[model samples]
Target chain A: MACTIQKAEALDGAHLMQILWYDEEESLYPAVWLRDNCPCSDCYLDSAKARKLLVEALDVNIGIKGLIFDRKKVYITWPDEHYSEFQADWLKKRCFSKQARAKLQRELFFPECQYWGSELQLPTLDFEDVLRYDEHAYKWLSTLKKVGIVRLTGASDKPGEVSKLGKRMGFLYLTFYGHTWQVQDKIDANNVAYTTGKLSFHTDYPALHHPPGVQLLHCIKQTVTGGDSEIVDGFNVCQKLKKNNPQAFQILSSTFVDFTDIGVDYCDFSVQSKHKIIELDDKGQVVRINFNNATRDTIFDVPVERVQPFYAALKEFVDLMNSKESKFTFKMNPGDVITFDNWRLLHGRRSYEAGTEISRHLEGAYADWDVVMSRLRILRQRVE
Target chain B: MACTIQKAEALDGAHLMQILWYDEEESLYPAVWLRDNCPCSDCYLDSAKARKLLVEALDVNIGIKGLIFDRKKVYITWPDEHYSEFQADWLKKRCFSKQARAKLQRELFFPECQYWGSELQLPTLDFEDVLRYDEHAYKWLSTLKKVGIVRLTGASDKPGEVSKLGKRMGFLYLTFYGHTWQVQDKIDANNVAYTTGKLSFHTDYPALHHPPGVQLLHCIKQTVTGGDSEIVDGFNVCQKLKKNNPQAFQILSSTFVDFTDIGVDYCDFSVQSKHKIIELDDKGQVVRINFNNATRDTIFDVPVERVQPFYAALKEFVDLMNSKESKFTFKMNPGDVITFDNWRLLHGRRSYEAGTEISRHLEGAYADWDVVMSRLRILRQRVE
Candidate 1:
């Protein structure tokens, strides 16, 4: 039964207390009583804004001036002449609310995707281009800004040519496992392994502490059938998950995951790095998503008690990736380029059989995100 | 020779400026200008402290009262109902002495490390024992305050146990090339080819956006011969670099780097990511360092003009890593466990001859730094 008080208790020493509001209630009830709460100079205001208040302000019988209880809230006026109104719904629960107490809970709990659905803003003019990078440069920048990576189409198929292409676009190719800017062509017995295989979704080069901000996948040859590239929007996936199962979403966001990269050129595989499964910047923005199923070590960092819910959320996200509606699938023909935002988009591929013929050959390059963004902005401003 | 001013320039604005002090002989000048040229009721309170400047005070130029110069400084007195004094060094630069003015140059820069060091107060307890935890139960509450990780040591000759050990540390063993958590029985021969035979010192999992705070490497057996593990303190390396080559040091601290993790287990090797090579936290502390030669893709992102300087600085840092005095090296004996801070320590291994006779089996585990630090604090408190 709800406790009803005939008379308000006099609080003499308490300065801070919790308040609850019920649904539709515009006013808040004093969960705790503090005494001598006066707004007058004797109690507060050192004649200036920042000075500490006198101790007399913290404890004394200043008393409440009045209370007006409506359907929505109960408003209370203290002797200090200050007033506060709280909702009725917040008072229904006795236990303290974590979300209610946080200063920016509304903004922090949800991911904001402001840039989605926006038009690509690649710079197109020569003077419009800050350094005269070609149309491919603009397209590359646009794709990376929108999706974290873009594919470059119509590129030559010469070995080591990717380095030059990368240089032309203002990116220097990084090498791992003896595969420098140009990914060494790998041919298996039946077909070219590099050209046709099922590839899982992942943010590339994340093993390097600083992964390239933008990824450029240039198709050197696209003759193979059924080797379509797949892209997934990690932010949208999280949004759907949050809407469907908030508990699971919370678990996934709070859980930590490990990722590591091992190359033949390096001994004793590099130390595995750990990061939060979901990350948000100070402005409550979902700045990045670091998910890779293959490189994920065990999910033991999360407390055993939270494991079930965390797994539920993680499984949901994984399922969402495999879900038909969320994925964008398209095959790149020769001369077609693809680029994306490495921090936001996850890319993969579907298996293709070479049969009696050779599969497609694709080479990739990378650029820093800020560089591409700067290029886009400089160009956009010039056009404007 | 320093140029001296014939007459002091009268104050015109209420902007504040910084003054730099480099040497005793040099006449000090305001590195930057100061606001509210006068200290009268219109400009400032007569008796108010420096920090408690009255924001609402009016601005007025009552004119100069008198100027006095000493060996250390020149003092300035304003003719106002209210009064205040400024250093003589500030007035010296404004003097008619041309020699004094010519020698004065701007030289002050903010030092973030020292600024943050002032705020750090190491807890009062011995927390060394909690450094090696398999899994942290109190990670959520304790780790964030101190930021440490756990290391598991004292393991027998069971090389296969690495994956299991990693699982016990609160996460699954992240795998590459389809070997999720499994130990490699042997290193591949093709992987050993490289231009630089001597591996440069660097951090692991640099590609990871959220790097694990602590890395635990457990040795199952010792090679009676080589394979000495080496660790170079990143902070020390940075400090030395700053002292030896300030310009190059600043470049490493300011420039950005790209890192990526792509493999067969997940997708084609096209995934990528990047970040600033050095990161300072909100408090201006040098909190993170990302450096990896193999994973650095310095293509389209960096301006072509800056590449030469960036590479030069990069090489300088590599040289510092190669310095003999910078690294602590030792071989791991059987049942020996080694743990290091991933952000602050760069780990390497001395090459072992192929015919070394004894096999070296090692396992690894990881935990977040915050979790480890928190555990240490709580455990230390309990014991104390």
Candidate 2:
């Protein structure tokens, strides 16, 4: 991972007032960029290894008096006789060429999303190692990021175990239902999750503009026989829809629908958020899958012409998700913890008996991707 | 908000295979939409006021058999002899015409963003009322959202008080530092905020893909002379930049810069997030303003030809923020809590003495817009 100045020589190609060399293979180093990124004590703060120089103070057309490099150092002297130095590899990592920038992009430790279906047997890790060891936690988090789901066992069968597990990963994303809520059957339940009924496959809290990214559900008790868990990879279904029916894919991605929740989520509140069934990023890649039929709002906010097409598109997409090849189902044990990406997966439960003969119980909590990614980076550094 | 079925007779505009009535100044309610939102025991669940209808089972192209309406109810019989009922007012709110939809858009209780400048006075509220009373909390939160910042007095002068204030509004957005962190001079501090220096105006945590939305800072002790807080409404400054120099605004909105933080907040981690200086929503309205020169990465990922233009554009934006016309500076005393929108406002602190003579101390924490908005909705309902 270390290189001495990227094995290149510096040349003064000053036609564009440039600092270039055949060098790290033809990467351009603009004079202003060099001046703004000077790593001297006055220009940078060692406390955070971040820049402190006032960017507005840099002259856009300042001339470079001299540029030189050695085995370990690249030095540039400005028109005001001020010097700046950077490691060769540091400069190499920050190269402006398309190829070099692409390389730097891949250097980040985040795992790429890998689509999966029913064939994927959930990777299982021990809770003790995941909560205590950096190496185990990194692998577990990467699995959650890439596979969009994972299982951990050997946690104590208690009401607050999910909260503890979620906190170890990151801070719990608190909702109106509390930081970590219990899943138990109750009279006149505020949410379907509290009942023993067979909940439909859906992402949780589609009514929020930014829903929780990750969900941690710990099975604290499960004496019942029929409360098996079902998981579906939303991105995988999206891919099949896009490849098989282009029109439906376009409708699902472009037509925004209002998802609403009106009930006492431990308090009286009403939430209505509008989002596309399939959301594409700036590069047109599918980044989010928002589908929750139960909480899908009554209002049809789209144009009247788009009404029938949207319903037909939604039906096709849901049909794809209902296939046996798409759903991954398994019964969880008392000490099992199922952690999955809420943005990329839809989860549900099969019906169990409502009678109080040692009923099924679970504890659930939520966390965002920010803290999870932050912890992964720290764990990687610690192990390294 | 309660309406008596919207005051109009339902007329069969079956000429267009639609139920359009001249009653409420003309609104169209499609047959398929009315069928989907049937509001019956089979199609809807009163538990959470959510839908339970199988959307895939719904026939999008099905024609209406008959439609009838009276005082409070609109009844529709499907081709299969199935009946659906809706409140006339409920039907009116979901009307799908341009003007009707515009009216519905304004029905949500959220306050619109109001831009401000140096002449604006920060609204002050009582901390006890903000945390305890629904009416007071709604007003306080609305002020925080609409005005971008607010001050709450009467908090206890102690560390960790910021966490309580933050939790009352929403969950504290935890980071590597903690759920809540303190700001006091320390040796070899991991962040520049811990040092006694003139910090430039900047939004917090640009290195996260989704940075914290709200920040609550409680002044535990502030006996220092020069440590005044300065706030700049970034959206107001962006509007000026857009109106004065459209070219600069365009460059900023289009150009992406990598913000990096490679330091420990009690642990070692590295975060590098790429974001445009100004971000727009789907409607091209400015939604986010990310500016943190101290944490701006060294990488100039832009094309070689575009490097100078970005810097020049950024310089113009920074100059607008630095102007007295935009900056609102004020000093704080103990027991004062300043809560502001971290995504929209840039904050800074002037230099203070680092000596051991009762140093300036402030505790801070973060929360996202999700919970703050959620709380506002609940509070509005409670007061009503």
Candidate 3:
């Protein structure tokens, strides 16, 4: 569990301490940072597993007084008579070496996804198994993280059952749409999703600064002729668009589009936000895809000259999403629950006949990725 | 209401257009930006008053073809033969020139506050006046912004009146504390504020990512002795600290302190966040002060060696806050409503005997700055 430290010495006018592990990798640790993170009983609360040191209580220019390392751990003594000991492996993992820092950065980014198209098989997990076993729930969540979508079979065909299943992974996220909402045609539908229409492939609630990360839709009834659910991995489409037309992809990624939701008679909700179609991290990797034509505000917030180029890029991206090769179509059955990452997948539906005496209803709920991921990690620790 | 454009020329390799206003100020506007912001009927919606240009539809690299100016407005012709006209004053206000930009930036920072102490006379407004007239409401809100605190006389003594008054300026912010909570000693008190003990000056809900901006407390009863409310302008103290001892100010502003709320048996709420005691904007001006001794986490996240120095700076700030010269102590009578900027004011209460039958209760509510500021601007437009 622990690595051996080969050597240790002060550097940069003794402001930093450099340590080399047995693997011959050298790393630098700031003297002040080292003292602050001391894991001693006096410096940290063992019960809460939290630090006891207050940053405001410390000297910013403090330097290391002494350092020594044994086979098991490294020890440091500060001028204030405070002492700290760190296990070699634990300290090595947090080393500020260029390679270690780069590795940490890579780990923080989302895992590389395997882009899928129409030919890809939908990942499935038995609802009963997931509810009955922690291991099954862990696997299901991990698959959802990797594939961006998952299908659950044999869920209870009851109203609000989606929220129960959602709780298995994490707490349900409440919005103006309510904790759990029914997706059925109504006279005064506040949103287009409530009515039977040919909805286009897009992410939900782009008007929110940080929209719901995960969406769960449970089919309660589907006796209609149409309304087949269609989903496209937005990242897949974006990757292809970037490959085929780099300039268009760049424009779409850089420019902002105003997304809005103006409520009707039923709800008093109104929100307007500007976001790029494709969001990228500092490393230029795709992090999220925001696309919703129905909710896209008429207001164009970008410069006049980029209007044509933005439309061109948007058209190309939409064309790629609508292409049969990039879409996966499925007909949800009664008790079938489909969960997808709202950040990476674009969902749509085929229009069904209205007033046909046939009914189609789905209970939908939302949860954030942070809650889901944390639950998955905790469950893995318990089950494995 | 419009000014004349004295002269105009291309800049930055024809990517931008520099215009000299009649006020003898030169400003640069991007060619595409100028065309995008055209207030013409074809470019902007008259009803919604929003831009209609789709950035993706235009060429970002396109330069202006021609420019003409009149006393009322300036006209520009695009390379694609599209034309745009802009009011000189409107264009000048949006200019990116050094002086114009600085003026706009200055407007965003907090207004100069009339720093008050123990000898200060409290700013007072009539509750009925604010509710009856838009002008009174605007003035009251502006005073709260500038003074960081305001006292309203002749408020209704009924419960939930604070929430009604809060709604006048913005929507009520709901928290684990409930919509309108009674501040009194309770048998099952989940928070220190609910008990009869002295609470040191601090803001509420520092654990939240976006803490409540404004807080309203309407006195329903105050028959008991002691419990006099005390408040200190946190920004004033911070400004003084910055001027007297910049090093201590820098430490408090730069270092992050963990503020947490571990829910009790009565409330199902918990949050943890790291924030500086003094929050500063990009220009090094105080924006907010987050100080809560009760909620500060025991864990010190800083280096061990600087712990003493951090404590030294923190002690100095605390001493200044505790000084009688910086505090405003006042007793509340029933129907006396006090409103304050939670971002800049630190509020506390003196300890009172709990065995006495005489009761002291107050109904409190919260609101966000966005809603309050928006309401103020709209009311100003309508009344002023």
Candidate 4:
């Protein structure tokens, strides 16, 4: 069922046209906004879904000459005698009321963030199913968008499978680490992840201005004994700190820390930048958490007085992430692919006791939300 | 030239270590900051330039027991009998003074923005020089960083050459549009760029959450009559608007507008997001300009009264972009490649009067600054 307009009336002084709905509900639309957004073939290109109307052609003080409403659409005659028509549902959907605007924003960012702790039931799907079926792909991506983590079982034990999964979504977001790089222990490695050592709970590649949003790691050889993977809900920890210790939360969220990753691994690349530990959205919600002690630069850019407080705040956050009540630990077997959101979840690995099977290997890749979310939405438009 | 320290003294009860410089200037380093940033081989991994010191191992109330400074290095002993060494130059570089931090940030973003308009002489480089030599690559990338646009001459009029050039920089950032897509006039085009019609002066792909930073377009087929390229420095326009139309600038910089590109060509994608016209850094310096009326969603997410003001502000910005004094227009020939920062420049094309040749094609690709700037810095580290 869609909303229908009963009549259209002009609010002269406000330059707004009010749409009287069949349910007697009133929705306001600015004359200029409506005129510029006219969806006619001449004004909008259906082939590209692009606006063809020029800003120069739009009248700032647009006047609605007359309107013909039949509970389906409001056909308007402009002052220039040009005609425009909008479906009743289209006009109702774009109502400018505060609540309506908020609702629209929420719809745009659908399936809002769902923060979780150790008790979370990690959604797991099938690799082949996701690749062949849009239903499984949509389910996998939606879980990643909401809970920030998901798992895929039965991936090929062969190389290039990780990239195939990535390409299935859209494309691979390559970094200095290379596209679909293998995870192995090398004495001449450039990153700590390359060594058989324990890693702390931290997001990957925080040194970049915009880090990759999603990380997919497929277990090709998992004969290791104690290399258990652990993850913590970074957003959940921020929410807890915001309630328990607002001062600590403020310090961590406001102070910018220099992150550096400079070495001669893939090449002699010097990647260093700064960002807050906790990032907040315009609505004051925790949107991202960029924390990595390994690449932590020497420079504490904050003032001397705030240095101790920053360390304290950082320590608190890290402790919370490592807490038993927050961290979820598990072991991945061969052919298991773990997909997680790098923006909201902090992932770590326990020190591996070199497996008796010679070597433990994993294949990993990165993709941004643009592709993952786009793939999910595109799948939704199809008959699943 | 590096700053040298004369002596190191601790300010009791302040938990700050003061470095008296050779120039009689003083710099302070907090105790916790020094302890956490101990750059020893044990505390740091030189292989990865990573911090090995665990945050749990860090003491927030760390104390400096004693110090030994011999002009070159400061050897300090902690209360735990742990000794640490810091080069005077390194310590000076990490100084946390307001001015020092600000200076460091400026250096991090080297060769600060040099906004330009029609009067600018666009730097031109040989494509062969850039691909074969590090010196030319460094020069080309440096100009792109400062002015947001650069041109390369003598590129092979080959189809795959655009991606080859992108590869030399680091890697190509792919979108749904493909890794290196061809720009040919197609009737079933999902984007307006696929047509030979005139395009408005607007940044590309503002519909994405974080749009690509760098765009490279190489001419493959040229015999066109009037397919000239036009560019406008969006940052320059924002600065002028700041000085001339402050209220219009305020409205654009603060108000968020919905941008959308919903259609199917290569694949089904529903790309939609919202961002302000102008984005400012922490210091209120203009950093990014997101403007694309073609993809502007119909929803005016603001209040009814503010809708007219938004249109007025947007029109002023667009008008300035199209002004003769601001737009830099030129005809591109075969073997010419234009690389630009998409975040700061508005690129458009003049309508082609059905090219005298069978078709007019351009090969274009995207790359983020992470790779471009990183490649530039990497080239700088090598010999000419």
Leading candidate by TM-score: 4
Clashes of each: 127, 1, 38, 0
lDDT for each residue of candidate 4 in B250-325, tens digit (9 for 90 to 100): 9998998899887765556788788988988767888888888789898778888888998898888888888888
Model 1 ranges off by over 4 Å: A1-143, A147-151, A159-165, A173-196, A265-271, A354-358, A374-384, B1-384
The runs of at least 3 residues in candidate 3 whose Cα sits more than 4 Å from the true structure, single-residue gaps closed, are: A6-9, A22-24, A40-48, A87-89, A98-112, A264-267, A356-358, B1-384
Model 2 misplaced stretches (Cα beyond 4 Å): A1-24, A109-111, A154-156, A223-225, A265-269, B1-24, B109-111, B129-135, B154-156, B266-268
| RMSD in Å for model 3 | 8.6
* TM-scores of chain A, one for each prediction: 0.57, 0.92, 0.92, 0.94
Q: Candidate 3: lDDT of B138?
A: 79
Instruction: Report the C-alpha displacement of residue A86, candidate 3, in angstroms.
Output: 3.7
Fraction of true contacts retained by every candidate, in order, equals 0.00, 0.65, 0.00, 0.78
Query: In candidate 4, which residue ranges exceed 4 Å CA deviation?
Result: A98-100, A264-268, A354-358, B1-5, B355-359
Tens-place lDDT per residue, model 1, B1-384, is 132322333332312122223332332222111223332333322221111122123232223444444334434554444454554444444432345423431111011121111122222211222234423323322332332222334445565444443333333322222222222233321111111122346665565555556666667755654567766667767777778998987777766555544323221222234556666653445677776544443121343235445655766776676677766556666666555567766766655545434355566655555333323434434444
lDDT of 3 by residue, A121-192 (tens): 999989989888999998888888889998999988788677677667646765557778888776555666
lDDT of 2 by residue, A308-363 (tens): 77888988888888899999999989899999999999888888887855588888
lDDT of 2 by residue, B211-271 (tens): 8899989999895568999999988998999999999999999888888777667444577
Q: Which one wins by DockQ: 1 or 3? A: 3
What TM-score applies to chain A of candidate 3?
0.92
